[PDB]
Amino acid sequence: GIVGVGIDLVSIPDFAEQVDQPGTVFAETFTPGERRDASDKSSSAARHLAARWAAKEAVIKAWSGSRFAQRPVLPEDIHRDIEVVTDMWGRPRVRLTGAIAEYLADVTIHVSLTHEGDTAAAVAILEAP
Amino acid sequence: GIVGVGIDLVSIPDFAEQVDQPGTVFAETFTPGERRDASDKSSSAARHLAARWAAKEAVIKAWSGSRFAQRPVLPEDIHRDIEVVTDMWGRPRVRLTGAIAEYLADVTIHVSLTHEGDTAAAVAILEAP
Amino acid sequence: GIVGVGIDLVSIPDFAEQVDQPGTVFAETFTPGERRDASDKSSSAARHLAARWAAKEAVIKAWSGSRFAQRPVLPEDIHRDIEVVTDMWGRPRVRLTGAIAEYLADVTIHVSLTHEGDTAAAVAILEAP
């Protein structure tokens, strides 16, 4: 039934301060214009994009923390294999591609994001048929 | 099998400064008693009600992020068809009435809430039977 | 099926004030060296140990908030019967001993942990065989 769970918290200021820096895992998962507008800790860009990163991380912990997570997990093409997106109705959906996709081969991920003030959070649950 | 998951954080300080503001969605869920007590930035009733609030928020996100989001849109019929209570013993429970109780006819709602510092939080999970 | 869920936030500042203090239920569950290092609010220890404590609370509430508790009454030696071990490359897992282990006899528990800035958090999820 439940393969996994994850929870992550993220400081929006601290994230805003480090999201835009040529050579990070941010570069490999956010758009330059997304990293750039998010550089601004007072913009909604930043507040929203912190939440999306918190979902990504929550998903990582949920899998990592499972069995479906191999004993040498996590090479480092695992941040854009997991993609956290808004769906047509305004709701979060995870999109797996790549090698993680193949692990999590046949599992449903539910996710929820939230943000308040300078803090942003997410949790993700992994199910199994 | 998990049909919905929600999480939401609320700012106990901001919450308490708007819980007694007239016209709001709060007056349909808390008693004028409560709303006024929950007006002091650190008064135990603030923290507690911030949390019931977060609880509610998080059940709403779990539903509007599921398949039975089948519109009867966001009428804030939902805001008053859904209620979070602190049972006799003090355990948090969900009460559904009206429309939502019909849509979530046979689903199971699990919540938990907490509050630390200036911040309250909660999480709900929706199960298909 | 899901039997219960649990979530908990902890102020690491406040925890590292009240953790090396005498007669606290901390003493009954953490090691005198453990609590002594978690006094430095800015240390690794205090972080690391706040997330373990939120873990315990998140599992305590998951079980508590259920009908798999029997009109809950906390058994004694809880907190310390609920262990938050890790699995080498740093993977959380819960360990039960004693009464709870019996009460939660054939339950599987999922936890995740997390700590950002000065708050730490955890979530738990209790499922039937």
CSV table of C-alpha atoms in Angstrom, one decimal:
chain,number,residue,atom,x,y,z
A,1,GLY,CA,0.0,0.0,0.0
A,2,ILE,CA,2.4,2.8,1.3
A,3,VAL,CA,5.9,2.7,-0.1
A,4,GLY,CA,7.0,6.0,1.4
A,5,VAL,CA,6.5,9.4,2.9
A,6,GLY,CA,8.3,12.7,2.8
A,7,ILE,CA,8.1,16.2,4.5
A,8,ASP,CA,10.3,19.1,3.8
A,9,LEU,CA,10.6,22.6,5.0
A,10,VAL,CA,12.2,25.4,3.1
A,11,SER,CA,13.2,28.9,4.1
A,12,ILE,CA,12.0,31.2,1.3
A,13,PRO,CA,14.7,33.8,2.0
A,14,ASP,CA,17.4,31.4,2.2
A,15,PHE,CA,16.2,29.8,-1.1
A,16,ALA,CA,15.9,33.1,-2.8
A,17,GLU,CA,19.4,33.9,-1.8
A,18,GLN,CA,20.8,30.7,-3.4
A,19,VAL,CA,18.3,29.7,-6.3
A,20,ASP,CA,20.2,31.9,-8.8
A,21,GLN,CA,23.8,30.8,-8.9
A,22,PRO,CA,25.3,29.4,-12.3
A,23,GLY,CA,26.4,25.7,-11.6
A,24,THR,CA,23.9,24.3,-8.9
A,25,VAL,CA,21.1,21.8,-8.9
A,26,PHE,CA,18.9,24.8,-9.3
A,27,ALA,CA,20.3,25.4,-12.7
A,28,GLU,CA,19.5,21.9,-13.6
A,29,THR,CA,15.7,22.1,-12.6
A,30,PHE,CA,14.8,25.8,-12.9
A,31,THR,CA,14.7,28.2,-15.9
A,32,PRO,CA,17.0,31.2,-15.8
A,33,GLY,CA,14.2,33.5,-15.8
A,34,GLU,CA,12.4,31.5,-13.1
A,35,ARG,CA,15.8,31.6,-10.9
A,36,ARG,CA,16.1,35.2,-11.7
A,37,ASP,CA,12.6,36.3,-10.7
A,38,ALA,CA,12.9,34.1,-7.6
A,39,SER,CA,16.2,35.8,-6.5
A,40,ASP,CA,13.7,38.3,-5.1
A,41,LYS,CA,12.6,37.1,-1.7
A,42,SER,CA,9.6,39.5,-1.8
A,43,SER,CA,8.1,38.2,-5.1
A,44,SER,CA,5.6,35.6,-5.5
A,45,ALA,CA,7.9,34.0,-7.9
A,46,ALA,CA,10.1,33.2,-5.0
A,47,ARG,CA,7.3,32.2,-2.7
A,48,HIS,CA,5.9,29.7,-5.3
A,49,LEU,CA,9.2,28.3,-6.4
A,50,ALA,CA,10.3,27.6,-2.9
A,51,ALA,CA,7.1,25.5,-2.5
A,52,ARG,CA,7.9,23.5,-5.7
A,53,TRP,CA,11.3,22.8,-4.5
A,54,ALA,CA,10.0,21.7,-1.1
A,55,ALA,CA,7.7,19.1,-3.2
A,56,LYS,CA,10.8,17.9,-5.1
A,57,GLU,CA,12.7,17.3,-1.9
A,58,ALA,CA,9.7,15.7,-0.2
A,59,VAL,CA,9.5,13.3,-3.0
A,60,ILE,CA,13.2,12.5,-2.8
A,61,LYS,CA,12.9,11.7,1.0
A,62,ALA,CA,9.8,9.6,0.5
A,63,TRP,CA,11.5,7.4,-2.1
A,64,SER,CA,14.9,7.3,-0.5
A,65,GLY,CA,13.4,6.4,2.7
A,66,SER,CA,11.7,3.3,1.1
A,67,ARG,CA,12.6,-0.1,0.0
A,68,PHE,CA,11.9,0.7,-3.7
A,69,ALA,CA,15.0,2.9,-3.0
A,70,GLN,CA,18.1,0.7,-4.0
A,71,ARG,CA,20.9,0.5,-1.4
A,72,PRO,CA,23.3,2.8,-3.3
A,73,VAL,CA,20.5,5.3,-4.1
A,74,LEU,CA,20.6,8.7,-5.8
A,75,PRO,CA,23.4,9.2,-8.5
A,76,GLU,CA,22.8,13.0,-9.3
A,77,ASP,CA,20.4,13.2,-12.2
A,78,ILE,CA,17.6,12.9,-9.7
A,79,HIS,CA,16.5,16.5,-9.4
A,80,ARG,CA,15.0,16.9,-12.9
A,81,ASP,CA,13.9,13.3,-13.1
A,82,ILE,CA,11.5,14.5,-10.4
A,83,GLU,CA,9.5,17.3,-11.7
A,84,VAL,CA,6.9,19.2,-9.7
A,85,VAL,CA,4.3,20.9,-11.7
A,86,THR,CA,1.0,22.8,-11.6
A,87,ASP,CA,-1.8,20.9,-13.4
A,88,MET,CA,-4.5,22.4,-15.6
A,89,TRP,CA,-6.9,23.0,-12.6
A,90,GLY,CA,-4.3,24.8,-10.5
A,91,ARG,CA,-3.2,21.6,-8.6
A,92,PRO,CA,0.2,19.9,-8.1
A,93,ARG,CA,1.2,16.8,-10.0
A,94,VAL,CA,4.6,15.1,-10.0
A,95,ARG,CA,6.1,13.9,-13.4
A,96,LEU,CA,8.7,11.3,-13.3
A,97,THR,CA,11.1,10.6,-16.1
A,98,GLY,CA,14.4,8.8,-16.3
A,99,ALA,CA,15.8,6.3,-14.0
A,100,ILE,CA,13.7,7.2,-10.9
A,101,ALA,CA,10.7,6.9,-13.2
A,102,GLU,CA,11.7,3.3,-13.7
A,103,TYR,CA,12.2,2.6,-10.1
A,104,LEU,CA,8.9,4.2,-9.0
A,105,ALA,CA,7.8,2.3,-12.0
A,106,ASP,CA,4.3,1.7,-11.0
A,107,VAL,CA,3.5,3.8,-8.0
A,108,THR,CA,1.2,6.7,-7.4
A,109,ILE,CA,2.6,9.9,-5.8
A,110,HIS,CA,0.3,12.3,-4.0
A,111,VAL,CA,1.7,15.7,-3.1
A,112,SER,CA,0.7,19.0,-1.3
A,113,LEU,CA,2.5,22.3,-1.2
A,114,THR,CA,1.9,25.3,1.1
A,115,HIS,CA,3.8,28.6,2.1
A,116,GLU,CA,3.4,31.2,4.8
A,117,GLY,CA,5.6,34.2,5.5
A,118,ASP,CA,9.2,32.9,5.0
A,119,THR,CA,8.6,29.3,5.3
A,120,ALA,CA,7.4,26.9,2.6
A,121,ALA,CA,6.5,23.1,3.1
A,122,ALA,CA,5.4,20.0,1.3
A,123,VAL,CA,4.6,16.3,1.8
A,124,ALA,CA,4.4,13.4,-0.5
A,125,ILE,CA,3.1,10.0,-0.1
A,126,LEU,CA,4.0,7.0,-2.3
A,127,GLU,CA,1.5,4.2,-2.9
A,128,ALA,CA,1.8,0.8,-4.5
A,129,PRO,CA,-0.8,-1.3,-6.4
B,1,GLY,CA,-6.3,4.0,-1.0
B,2,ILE,CA,-5.2,7.6,-0.5
B,3,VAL,CA,-7.4,9.6,-2.8
B,4,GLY,CA,-6.2,13.0,-1.5
B,5,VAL,CA,-3.5,14.5,0.6
B,6,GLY,CA,-3.2,18.1,2.1
B,7,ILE,CA,-0.9,20.2,4.1
B,8,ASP,CA,-1.1,23.8,5.2
B,9,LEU,CA,0.8,26.2,7.5
B,10,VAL,CA,-0.6,29.3,8.9
B,11,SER,CA,1.1,32.3,10.7
B,12,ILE,CA,-0.3,32.4,14.2
B,13,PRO,CA,0.5,36.2,14.4
B,14,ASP,CA,-1.2,37.1,11.0
B,15,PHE,CA,-4.0,34.8,11.8
B,16,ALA,CA,-4.8,36.3,15.0
B,17,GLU,CA,-4.9,39.8,13.4
B,18,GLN,CA,-7.5,38.8,10.9
B,19,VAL,CA,-9.6,36.2,12.7
B,20,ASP,CA,-11.8,39.0,14.1
B,21,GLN,CA,-12.2,41.0,10.8
B,22,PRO,CA,-15.9,41.4,9.7
B,23,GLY,CA,-17.2,40.0,6.5
B,24,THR,CA,-14.8,37.0,6.6
B,25,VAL,CA,-14.8,33.2,6.1
B,26,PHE,CA,-13.8,33.0,9.8
B,27,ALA,CA,-17.2,33.9,11.3
B,28,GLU,CA,-18.8,31.1,9.6
B,29,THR,CA,-16.4,28.6,11.3
B,30,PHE,CA,-15.6,30.1,14.7
B,31,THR,CA,-17.8,31.6,17.4
B,32,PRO,CA,-17.5,35.4,18.0
B,33,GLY,CA,-16.1,34.2,21.4
B,34,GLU,CA,-13.3,32.3,19.9
B,35,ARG,CA,-12.5,34.9,17.2
B,36,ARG,CA,-12.0,37.6,19.8
B,37,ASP,CA,-10.0,35.5,22.2
B,38,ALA,CA,-7.8,34.4,19.1
B,39,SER,CA,-7.1,38.0,18.6
B,40,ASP,CA,-4.1,38.1,21.0
B,41,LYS,CA,-0.8,37.1,19.0
B,42,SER,CA,0.0,34.6,21.7
B,43,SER,CA,-2.9,33.5,23.7
B,44,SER,CA,-3.2,29.7,23.4
B,45,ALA,CA,-6.7,30.1,21.9
B,46,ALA,CA,-4.9,31.8,19.0
B,47,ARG,CA,-2.5,28.9,18.6
B,48,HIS,CA,-5.2,26.4,18.9
B,49,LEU,CA,-7.6,28.0,16.5
B,50,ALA,CA,-4.8,28.8,14.0
B,51,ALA,CA,-4.3,25.1,14.1
B,52,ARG,CA,-7.9,24.1,13.6
B,53,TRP,CA,-7.8,26.4,10.8
B,54,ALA,CA,-4.8,24.9,9.3
B,55,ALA,CA,-6.5,21.5,9.7
B,56,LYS,CA,-9.5,22.8,7.7
B,57,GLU,CA,-7.3,24.3,5.1
B,58,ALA,CA,-5.5,21.2,4.7
B,59,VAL,CA,-8.7,19.0,4.3
B,60,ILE,CA,-9.9,21.6,1.6
B,61,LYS,CA,-6.5,21.1,-0.3
B,62,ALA,CA,-6.7,17.5,-0.1
B,63,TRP,CA,-10.2,17.5,-1.7
B,64,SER,CA,-9.6,20.1,-4.3
B,65,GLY,CA,-6.5,18.2,-5.3
B,66,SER,CA,-8.4,15.0,-6.0
B,67,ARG,CA,-10.7,13.4,-8.5
B,68,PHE,CA,-14.0,14.5,-6.7
B,69,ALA,CA,-13.0,18.1,-7.1
B,70,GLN,CA,-15.9,17.6,-9.6
B,71,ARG,CA,-16.5,21.2,-9.5
B,72,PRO,CA,-19.6,22.2,-7.3
B,73,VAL,CA,-16.6,24.5,-7.7
B,74,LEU,CA,-15.1,26.4,-4.7
B,75,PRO,CA,-18.5,27.9,-3.7
B,76,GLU,CA,-17.1,28.4,0.0
B,77,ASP,CA,-20.1,26.1,0.4
B,78,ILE,CA,-17.0,23.9,1.1
B,79,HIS,CA,-15.9,26.4,3.7
B,80,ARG,CA,-19.0,25.6,5.8
B,81,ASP,CA,-19.7,22.1,4.7
B,82,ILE,CA,-16.3,21.1,6.3
B,83,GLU,CA,-15.5,21.5,9.9
B,84,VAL,CA,-12.6,20.6,12.1
B,85,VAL,CA,-13.4,19.8,15.7
B,86,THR,CA,-11.3,18.8,18.9
B,87,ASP,CA,-13.2,15.8,20.0
B,88,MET,CA,-14.3,15.2,23.8
B,89,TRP,CA,-10.9,13.5,24.6
B,90,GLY,CA,-9.1,16.3,22.5
B,91,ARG,CA,-8.4,14.4,19.5
B,92,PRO,CA,-9.0,16.3,16.1
B,93,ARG,CA,-11.9,15.0,14.0
B,94,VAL,CA,-13.6,16.1,10.7
B,95,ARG,CA,-17.2,16.8,10.4
B,96,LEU,CA,-18.7,16.8,7.0
B,97,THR,CA,-22.0,18.2,6.2
B,98,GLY,CA,-24.0,19.2,3.1
B,99,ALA,CA,-22.6,18.9,-0.4
B,100,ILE,CA,-19.1,17.7,0.5
B,101,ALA,CA,-20.5,15.0,2.7
B,102,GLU,CA,-22.2,13.6,-0.2
B,103,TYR,CA,-19.2,13.9,-2.6
B,104,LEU,CA,-16.9,12.4,0.0
B,105,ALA,CA,-19.6,9.9,0.7
B,106,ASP,CA,-17.6,6.9,1.6
B,107,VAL,CA,-14.2,8.4,2.0
B,108,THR,CA,-12.1,8.5,5.2
B,109,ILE,CA,-10.4,11.6,6.5
B,110,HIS,CA,-7.3,11.5,8.7
B,111,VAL,CA,-6.0,14.7,10.1
B,112,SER,CA,-3.4,15.9,12.5
B,113,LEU,CA,-2.4,19.4,13.7
B,114,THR,CA,0.4,21.0,15.6
B,115,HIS,CA,1.7,24.6,16.6
B,116,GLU,CA,5.2,25.7,17.5
B,117,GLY,CA,6.5,29.2,17.8
B,118,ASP,CA,4.7,31.6,15.6
B,119,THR,CA,3.5,28.9,13.4
B,120,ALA,CA,0.7,26.4,13.2
B,121,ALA,CA,0.4,23.4,10.8
B,122,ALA,CA,-1.7,20.4,9.8
B,123,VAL,CA,-2.1,17.5,7.4
B,124,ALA,CA,-5.0,15.5,6.0
B,125,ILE,CA,-5.3,12.3,4.0
B,126,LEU,CA,-8.3,11.1,2.1
B,127,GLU,CA,-8.9,7.3,1.7
B,128,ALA,CA,-11.2,5.5,-0.7
B,129,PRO,CA,-12.8,2.6,1.1
C,1,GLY,CA,-5.7,0.8,5.5
C,2,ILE,CA,-4.4,4.0,6.9
C,3,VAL,CA,-5.0,3.7,10.7
C,4,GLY,CA,-3.7,7.1,11.7
C,5,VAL,CA,-1.6,10.1,10.7
C,6,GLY,CA,0.6,12.6,12.6
C,7,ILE,CA,2.4,15.7,12.1
C,8,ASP,CA,4.7,17.9,14.5
C,9,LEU,CA,6.7,21.1,14.6
C,10,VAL,CA,9.3,21.9,17.0
C,11,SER,CA,11.2,25.0,17.8
C,12,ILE,CA,14.7,24.1,17.9
C,13,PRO,CA,15.5,27.2,20.0
C,14,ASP,CA,12.9,26.3,22.5
C,15,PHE,CA,13.9,22.6,22.5
C,16,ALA,CA,17.5,23.3,23.1
C,17,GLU,CA,16.5,25.4,26.1
C,18,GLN,CA,14.3,22.8,27.8
C,19,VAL,CA,16.1,19.6,26.8
C,20,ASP,CA,19.1,19.6,29.2
C,21,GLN,CA,16.7,20.7,32.1
C,22,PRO,CA,16.0,18.3,35.1
C,23,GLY,CA,12.8,16.3,35.6
C,24,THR,CA,11.6,16.7,31.9
C,25,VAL,CA,10.3,13.7,30.0
C,26,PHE,CA,13.4,14.3,27.8
C,27,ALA,CA,15.5,12.6,30.5
C,28,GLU,CA,13.5,9.5,30.4
C,29,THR,CA,14.1,9.1,26.6
C,30,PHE,CA,17.4,10.8,25.8
C,31,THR,CA,20.9,10.1,26.9
C,32,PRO,CA,22.7,12.6,29.2
C,33,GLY,CA,25.3,13.3,26.5
C,34,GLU,CA,22.5,13.6,23.8
C,35,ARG,CA,20.7,16.3,25.8
C,36,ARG,CA,23.9,18.0,26.7
C,37,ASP,CA,24.9,18.5,23.1
C,38,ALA,CA,21.4,19.6,22.1
C,39,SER,CA,21.7,22.6,24.3
C,40,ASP,CA,23.7,24.4,21.6
C,41,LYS,CA,20.7,25.7,19.5
C,42,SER,CA,23.0,26.1,16.6
C,43,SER,CA,24.7,22.8,16.7
C,44,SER,CA,24.1,19.7,14.6
C,45,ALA,CA,23.0,17.9,17.6
C,46,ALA,CA,20.1,20.2,18.4
C,47,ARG,CA,18.8,20.1,15.0
C,48,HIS,CA,19.2,16.3,14.6
C,49,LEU,CA,17.5,15.7,17.9
C,50,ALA,CA,14.6,18.0,17.5
C,51,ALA,CA,13.6,16.1,14.3
C,52,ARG,CA,13.8,12.8,16.3
C,53,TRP,CA,11.6,14.3,18.9
C,54,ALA,CA,9.1,15.5,16.3
C,55,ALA,CA,9.2,12.0,15.0
C,56,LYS,CA,8.1,10.6,18.2
C,57,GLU,CA,5.3,13.1,18.8
C,58,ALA,CA,4.0,12.5,15.0
C,59,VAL,CA,3.9,8.8,15.7
C,60,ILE,CA,2.4,9.3,19.2
C,61,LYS,CA,-0.5,11.4,17.6
C,62,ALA,CA,-1.0,9.0,14.7
C,63,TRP,CA,-1.8,6.2,17.1
C,64,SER,CA,-3.6,8.4,19.5
C,65,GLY,CA,-5.8,9.9,17.0
C,66,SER,CA,-7.2,6.5,16.2
C,67,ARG,CA,-9.8,3.8,17.2
C,68,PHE,CA,-6.6,1.3,17.2
C,69,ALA,CA,-5.6,2.8,20.6
C,70,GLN,CA,-8.8,1.8,22.6
C,71,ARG,CA,-10.3,5.3,24.1
C,72,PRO,CA,-6.5,6.3,24.2
C,73,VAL,CA,-4.6,6.2,27.4
C,74,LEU,CA,-0.9,6.7,27.1
C,75,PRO,CA,0.9,3.6,28.2
C,76,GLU,CA,4.1,4.4,30.0
C,77,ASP,CA,7.6,4.2,28.6
C,78,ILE,CA,6.3,5.8,25.3
C,79,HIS,CA,8.7,8.3,23.8
C,80,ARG,CA,11.5,5.9,24.7
C,81,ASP,CA,9.6,3.0,23.3
C,82,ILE,CA,9.4,4.8,20.0
C,83,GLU,CA,12.8,4.9,18.4
C,84,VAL,CA,14.0,6.8,15.6
C,85,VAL,CA,16.9,4.8,14.3
C,86,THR,CA,18.7,5.5,10.9
C,87,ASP,CA,19.9,3.1,8.1
C,88,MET,CA,23.6,4.0,7.3
C,89,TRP,CA,23.3,6.3,4.3
C,90,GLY,CA,20.8,8.3,6.8
C,91,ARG,CA,17.4,6.7,6.3
C,92,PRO,CA,14.8,7.1,9.2
C,93,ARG,CA,13.0,4.0,10.5
C,94,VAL,CA,10.9,3.6,13.7
C,95,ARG,CA,11.5,1.1,16.3
C,96,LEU,CA,8.8,-0.1,18.8
C,97,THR,CA,9.2,-1.9,22.1
C,98,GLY,CA,6.9,-2.7,24.9
C,99,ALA,CA,3.2,-2.0,25.2
C,100,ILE,CA,3.0,0.2,22.0
C,101,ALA,CA,4.6,-2.5,20.1
C,102,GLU,CA,1.7,-4.7,21.2
C,103,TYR,CA,-0.9,-2.1,20.6
C,104,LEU,CA,0.7,-1.3,17.3
C,105,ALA,CA,1.4,-4.9,16.8
C,106,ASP,CA,0.9,-5.4,13.2
C,107,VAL,CA,1.0,-1.8,12.1
C,108,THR,CA,3.7,-0.6,9.7
C,109,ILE,CA,4.8,3.0,10.4
C,110,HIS,CA,6.3,5.5,7.8
C,111,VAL,CA,8.0,8.6,9.1
C,112,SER,CA,9.8,11.4,7.4
C,113,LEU,CA,11.9,14.1,9.0
C,114,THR,CA,13.1,17.6,8.3
C,115,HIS,CA,14.6,20.9,9.8
C,116,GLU,CA,14.8,24.3,8.3
C,117,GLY,CA,16.4,27.4,9.9
C,118,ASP,CA,15.1,27.0,13.4
C,119,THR,CA,12.2,24.7,13.1
C,120,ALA,CA,12.1,21.1,12.8
C,121,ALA,CA,9.3,18.8,11.6
C,122,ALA,CA,8.3,15.3,11.0
C,123,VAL,CA,5.3,13.4,9.7
C,124,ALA,CA,4.1,9.8,10.4
C,125,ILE,CA,1.7,7.3,8.9
C,126,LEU,CA,0.3,4.1,10.3
C,127,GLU,CA,-1.1,1.5,8.1
C,128,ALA,CA,-2.6,-2.1,8.8
C,129,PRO,CA,-1.0,-5.4,7.4
